[PDB]
Design an enzyme around this catalytic site. Structure first.
Site, PDB file in Angstrom:
ATOM      1  CG  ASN A  51     -13.167 104.546  10.192  1.00 56.67           C
ATOM      2  OD1 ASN A  51     -12.304 104.791  11.020  1.00 56.67           O
ATOM      3  ND2 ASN A  51     -13.049 105.023   8.930  1.00 56.67           N
ATOM      4  CG  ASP A  59      -7.533 107.174  12.354  1.00 58.36           C
ATOM      5  OD1 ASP A  59      -7.750 108.284  11.880  1.00 58.36           O
ATOM      6  OD2 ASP A  59      -7.974 106.074  11.836  1.00 58.36           O
ATOM      7  CD  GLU A 108      -8.138  98.914  15.905  1.00 56.38           C
ATOM      8  OE1 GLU A 108      -7.533  99.524  16.782  1.00 56.38           O
ATOM      9  OE2 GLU A 108      -8.119  99.280  14.635  1.00 56.38           O
ATOM     10  CE1 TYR A 109     -15.790  90.961  13.347  1.00 57.34           C
ATOM     11  CE2 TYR A 109     -15.235  92.150  15.375  1.00 57.34           C
ATOM     12  CZ  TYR A 109     -16.138  91.365  14.641  1.00 57.34           C
ATOM     13  OH  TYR A 109     -17.395  91.034  15.171  1.00 57.34           O
ATOM     14  CB  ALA A 110     -16.103  94.086  10.747  1.00 60.90           C
ATOM     15  CD  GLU A 116      -2.647 105.223  17.581  1.00 60.86           C
ATOM     16  OE1 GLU A 116      -3.721 104.950  18.092  1.00 60.86           O
ATOM     17  OE2 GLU A 116      -2.383 105.005  16.331  1.00 60.86           O
ATOM     18  CD  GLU A 175      -2.883 101.572  14.586  1.00 62.57           C
ATOM     19  OE1 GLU A 175      -3.522 102.560  14.812  1.00 62.57           O
ATOM     20  OE2 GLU A 175      -2.987 100.930  13.448  1.00 62.57           O
TER      21      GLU A 175
HETATM   22 MG    MG Z   1      -3.331 104.725  14.487  1.00 57.58          MG
HETATM   23 NA    NA Z   2     -10.183 106.012  10.890  1.00 57.30          NA
END
Ligand code: MG
Ligand code: NA
Ligand code: MG
Ligand code: MG
Ligand code: MG
Ligand code: MG
Ligand code: NA
Ligand code: NA
Ligand code: NA
Ligand code: NA
Ligand code: NA
Lengths: 1011, 409
Positions: free
Chosen positions: A592, A189, A525-527, A404, A449
């Site tokens: 993000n 991503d 991953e969080y928050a 990924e 992922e």
């Molecule tokens: Mg991804």
């Molecule tokens: Na993103």
């Protein structure tokens, strides 16, 4: 052949991977990490031409430069130079899913360089070229002759050019494919770019050379003794006279050394590795490495003849540390870590995916200054200098394979397929071969992922065999699969379960105790810090401190992936998905970060800093108890500053040196304090200050703070009488009240305060009206799109219920003259298609002092979705330079993201009261405010507010911050109540129930006066 | 009363509602629901609108979906509430036919009232004197004492309705959990009761800050402000308005401030001793049994009506007892109180309850003591020897607002 459409061919003629080499020919230069004359950089000006497909490249290009080529800087991503567009797609692949094929229209970057090679390099030894990062696949020619091929955009591809070069001028030709079968394993991503985006270098090694070396450090039970073991392999001329000497230095002092001839122990029936040797050095009371104190030694690996000729030397920084999981806990040097981590992509708004020292340094300093101690390489091996820097500045690192395949259906379609085992293997194995001697790397990850496939199981095992010193983790397939030593979910909530089928995200507290589970849990991953977010952050930190096996997590993520674009006028502006014609695209989902692309912080950063503090405090009477969360260091660069203020007015203050051992406590008894007779609340604020500068912070840096309410003296003081009574004048359309130089006008048809005059100057541009909505946050919208509405998203629920379009209907509007005041009473109903959504009843009491007291009581239908806010708003005529308030601050803060804010008297320029999130939304709120001053106005009460030049309507209607325009006057939103902002994720509702406005009845009161 | 809370939380059937859909999940490990039927009922503010029954047929650990029929619109403002009960039609070795084994409620649509009342037939008159503000409306009279700042008397005809004035109340007769192991002979200063005593909560006295009267177009408005202090510290400040209109309703608005450094109080409400005694107590709120903020799950929102003594819980060691929360309307004698409050009503003052160690020694006082709370502290019970009331059930907001309408019925 179309080697780029064949996962069975991932390279041709590529050399073996290995740790960083420099081939020093002098040991002291190796010891000092000074530059090596044998390792040259080929970075600089290159020639480049773009083609729409490899079939369009002309053959002449192999033999000579194309006249139409341009000169460009390398490393670079060609999209950054405008040759083609970068694409921002999140999960869906940027190409049609049809493995292993790619589009026949496949942007091809033809790079070339004419450079020099000194004859001496060619008289002996080997000269290789090294490309640290080429995205995504490439063919290499030297002097018109084909050399080889490589895949994996994120690790170095090295080729021996010994036989292709000649003294003097030489010319490289690199044909870079944007898409290849490697792309099916590169679906992270982020922006989809291409090119020679990491360093290019030339390395001379001798014919008899160090081909690999691994350094390990093992300890006794209390870490007072260690054995450094270094296995060294050679290639070339194996003879009895060769030896390896490994020496270990602490500064300019040699602490240990060992010399041995080649020939390792017998390993099997056929013997041992005659081309390898293992040296073992004993080290007493080693200085241990941690992110807290990144103590390092230097190991120099000398290949030499026994009689004394150094052939070549390689070397590395060594950190004595042991990483192990025992009894369910991840321990570092025997102590359990608490990971204050963040995921960090390699992103620069101007240079794309090209990293530079300055930028990396800047990020590491800010990470540390914000109490982060760990970073996850989401989702690929990083530029080599990153590791050097985390080793030296001290950050724990999760090194992650460049694998990924998120867009596959199901996600493990390739990872469970044996035919993709070889391509995946290389991504894991070559990473470990390159980064295995860096102390900063403490955990290896299998990628991201890609579901859970048997390939992951095989690879998990490979690493565990080759490198027992570090745990292996991997989140795919449900985060607790057999391919992970750590439960490493992404976005699992603290208390709330999300029982999706097959890959549920259990509450993290419940996950640890599922029947038979014993592993530590660290969120990969969080928050999700997208836009106005980090709501609920504190809930995570409270759980982490409370549960031993909850050892932290890595915030998603460090920096927004916005790119700079230039407007007609040539002014830069932050762009996101689709801003380059790219489609399909995932819009603002690429932003993000805790910080903006230029490293400016978003407000959430201070919340992370605070929750991630290394000192905890408790207050008991006047005793302050400080507890250290450091595991290995004493608070040798810290003092405690304390201050007591009465509603912002400073009363007393002091400083006390902090002397707490790791995990220790210190009690500090404060002085007899002020017990003023004067009304107000006493507030104690303590801050931990580092008096001395460090490698990562300036003298005086504040590392922690906390506040407590002390004694409160409620006001019982009666205001003196006013030598005056306001007068009322009525007409069918209005109620006008006058008092001295002041006037108020209430519209009887609308039921609102339509204007106010101070002196004879009008004060409002729009009337004062209730407001139940907000310009939706990224977390309110989630994945909803016009094209594909997500009805469960908050924004959609508000829309469908009519909140944004409900019209006030007047139910009552009266005026009464009191003894010493005029009272106006109103009631309004907000309806939608027959449904009454909210009812607002208020009174406005204007007295002889000229103050206007407003009381508001709202009813909210229990069956309508809980509203974003319950407040009033108006556009003031005035634009003033500053905003002064007594309440939480100084930065933007929301109900579920206000722990970092401190109550005090703050005063900032108007502009600071707006947060320029790239994708505009409600922003700049400050909560827990008791008094607000703006121009001639003062509002008092217990509310939250925002104030800026932009209406909620404008913010909701504009997609990019650079398109916003200051409106006339200033928009003020003053809320009795405001909904939390959420953020546990940015694609499902995440505002915790206690932060939703579901009480049904709400009461607030304000006094509006002048000064 | 705690038994019913236990029964409810330990139910063997779990329910969820989605639209017209009710999903029943069985928590039995071995038996099918072969002696159970689901009864449902929809009521508007206590008035039954519709109901039905469906046989339950759920395997152990399984689920059953039940579609409710189209819910005819309702002709009136109010909150619709759905209640479901699991009833066992047949007697068993341990229960009689009709035994209710489980229940749950949900709010359904709510239609807020936007209907303007209607122009009072009359206008109350204010009579001001040196020591009082009196309001007369028809055959009703209200008297506010100017030195005390409280409503000290109210008459229906020539009949006085109060024995003691209507005053704020911030304390409660201590529960066992508030006391813990504290003893006169060995105080546990950490116990709730000891924190409250020490802070002067039980000794604080109301000091008047303001008492004004104004006449509006159709009403008379009394405004008062009081401070409760102890050893020179202001513990609480209560500001109110009493608005008496042409309809005879008295609207009471209460805004209280609680110093941040004082221990969180047991309650924030008003109290009075009514002159009369009545046979029944009728309310629209949670019940029918005693319920507290942290112990009210089992209670249901409906219209309940019980004999006054059922409104008192005879705990052997007496204390605050008999509260009902979530009450929108309370009726007693000719009086009606409307709002969103918690209340208790009995022949015993909090004072007596706190001064009496055994229930057998309590004696009914004259009239009826009414405690009506905007907010009430949780009762706790995780243990009874250390403070056990959860933060979320402590009255720590600092500023509190509530409003009630007292009118005649
Ligand atoms: Mg991804
Ligand atoms: Na993103
Ligand atoms: Mg290939
Ligand atoms: Mg030497
Ligand atoms: Mg020579
Ligand atoms: Mg899209
Ligand atoms: Na922990
Ligand atoms: Na210190
Ligand atoms: Na927007
Ligand atoms: Na049944
Ligand atoms: Na008692």
């Amino acid at each position: 052949r179309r080697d780029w459409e064949n996962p069975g061919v991932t390279q041709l003629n590529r050399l073996a991977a290995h740790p960083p080499f420099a081939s020093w020919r002098n040991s002291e230069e190796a010891r000092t990490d000074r530059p090596s004359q044998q390792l040259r950089s080929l970075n600089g000006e290159w020639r480049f031409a773009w083609f729409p497909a490899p079939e369009a490249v002309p053959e002449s290009w192999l033999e000579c430069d194309l006249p139409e080529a341009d000169t460009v800087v390398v490393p670079s991503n060609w999209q950054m130079h405008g040759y083609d567009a970068p694409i921002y797609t999140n999960v869906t692949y940027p190409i049609t899913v049809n493995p292993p094929f790619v589009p026949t229209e496949n942007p091809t970057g033809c790079y070339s360089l004419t450079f020099n090679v000194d004859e001496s390099w060619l008289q002996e030894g080997q000269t290789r070229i090294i490309f640290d990062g080429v995205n995504s696949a490439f063919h290499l020619w030297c002097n018109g002759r084909w050399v080889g091929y490589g895949q994996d955009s994120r690790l170095p591809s090295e080729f021996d050019l010994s036989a292709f070069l000649r003294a003097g001028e030489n010319r490289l030709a690199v044909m870079v494919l944007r898409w290849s079968d490697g792309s099916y394993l590169e679906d992270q991503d982020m922006w989809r770019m291409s090119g020679i985006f990491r360093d290019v270098s030339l390395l001379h090694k001798p014919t008899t050379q160090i081909s690999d070396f691994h350094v390990a450090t093992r300890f006794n039970d209390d870490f007072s003794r260690a054995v450094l073991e270094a296995e060294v392999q050679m290639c070339g001329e194996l003879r009895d006279y060769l030896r390896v000497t490994v020496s270990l230095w602490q500064g300019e002092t040699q602490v240990a050394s060992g010399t041995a001839p080649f020939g390792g122990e017998i390993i099997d029936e056929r013997g041992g590795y005659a081309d390898r040797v293992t040296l073992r050095l004993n080290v007493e009371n080693p200085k241990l490495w941690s992110a807290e104190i990144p103590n390092l030694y230097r190991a120099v690996v000398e290949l030499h003849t026994a009689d004394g000729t150094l052939i070549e030397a390689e070397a590395c920084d060594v950190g004595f540390r042991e990483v192990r999981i025992e009894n369910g806990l991840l321990l570092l040097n025997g102590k359990p870590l608490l990971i204050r981590g963040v995921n960090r992509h390699e992103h620069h708004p101007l240079h794309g995916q090209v990293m530079d020292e300055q930028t990396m340094v800047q990020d590491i300093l800010l990470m540390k200054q914000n109490n982060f101690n760990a970073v996850r390489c989401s989702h690929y091996p990083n530029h080599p200098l990153w590791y050097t820097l985390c080793d030296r500045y001290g950050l724990y690192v999760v090194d992650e394979a460049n694998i990924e395949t998120n867009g596959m259906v199901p996600m493990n379609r390739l990872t469970d397929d044996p035919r993709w085992l070889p391509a995946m293997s290389e991504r894991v194995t070559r990473m470990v071969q390159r980064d295995r001697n860096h102390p900063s790397v403490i955990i290896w990850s299998l990628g991201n992922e890609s579901g859970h496939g048997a390939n992951h199981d095989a690879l998990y095992r490979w690493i565990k065999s080759v490198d027992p010193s570090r745990p292996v983790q991997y989140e795919g397939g449900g985060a607790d699969t057999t391919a992970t030593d750590i439960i490493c979910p992404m976005y699992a909530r603290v208390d709330e379960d999300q029982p999706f089928p097959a890959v549920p995200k259990w509450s993290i507290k419940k996950w640890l105790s599922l029947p038979g589970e014993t592993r530590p849990l660290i969120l990969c991953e969080y928050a999700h810090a997208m836009g106005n977010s980090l709501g609920g952050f504190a809930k995570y930190w409270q759980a982490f401190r409370q549960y031993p096996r909850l050892q932290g997590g890595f915030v998603w993520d460090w920096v927004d992936q916005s790119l700079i674009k230039y407007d007609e006028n040539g002014n830069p502006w932050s762009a996101y998905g689709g801003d380059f014609g790219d489609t399909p695209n995932d819009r603002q989902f690429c932003m993000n970060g805790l910080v903006f692309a230029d490293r400016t912080p978003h407000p959430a950063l201070t919340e992370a800093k605070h929750q991630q503090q290394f000192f905890q405090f408790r207050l008991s009477g006047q005793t302050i108890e400080v507890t250290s969360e450091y595991l290995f260091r004493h608070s040798d660069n810290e003092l405690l500053h304390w201050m007591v203020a009465l509603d912002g007015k400073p009363l007393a203050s002091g400083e006390v040196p902090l002397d707490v051992a790791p995990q220790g406590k210190q009690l500090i008894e404060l002085p007899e304090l002020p017990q003023p007779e004067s009304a107000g609340q006493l507030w104690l604020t303590v801050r931990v200050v580092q008096p001395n500068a460090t490698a990562w912070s300036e003298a005086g840096h504040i590392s922690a703070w906390q506040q407590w309410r002390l004694a409160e003296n409620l006001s019982v003081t009666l205001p003196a009488a006013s030598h005056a009574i306001p007068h009322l004048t009525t007409s069918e359309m209005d109620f006008c009240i006058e008092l001295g130089n002041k006037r108020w006008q209430f519209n009887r048809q609308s039921g609102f305060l339509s204007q106010m005059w101070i002196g004879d100057k009008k004060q409002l541009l729009t009337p004062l009206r209730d407001q139940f909505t907000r310009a939706p946050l990224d977390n309110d919208i989630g994945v909803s799109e016009a094209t594909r509405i997500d009805p469960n998203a908050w924004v959609e629920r508000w829309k469908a219920a009519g909140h944004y379009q409900a019209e006030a209907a007047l139910l009552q509007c009266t005026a009464d003259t009191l003894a010493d005041a005029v009272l106006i009473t109103t009631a309004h109903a907000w309806q939608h298609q027959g449904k009454t959504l909210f009812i607002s009843r208020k009174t406005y009491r204007i007295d002889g002092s000229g103050q206007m007291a407003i009381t508001v009581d709202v009813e909210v239908a229990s069956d309508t979705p809980h509203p974003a806010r319950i407040g009033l708003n108006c556009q003031l005529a005035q634009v003033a330079e500053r905003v002064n308030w007594l309440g939480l601050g100084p930065q933007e803060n929301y109900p579920d993201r206000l722990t970092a804010a401190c109550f005090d008297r703050w005063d900032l320029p108007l502009s600071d009261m707006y947060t320029p999130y790239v994708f505009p939304s409600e922003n700049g709120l400050r909560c827990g405010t008791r008094e607000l001053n703006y121009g001639p106005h003062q509002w008092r009460g217990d509310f939250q507010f925002n104030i800026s030049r932009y209406s909620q309507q404008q913010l909701m209607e504009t997609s990019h911050r650079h398109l916003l325009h200051a409106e006339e006057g200033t928009w003020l939103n003053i809320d009795g109540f405001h909904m939390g902002i959420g953020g546990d994720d940015s694609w499902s509702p995440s505002v915790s129930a206690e932060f939703q406005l579901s009480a049904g009845r709400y009461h607030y009161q304000l006094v509006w006066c002048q000064k």
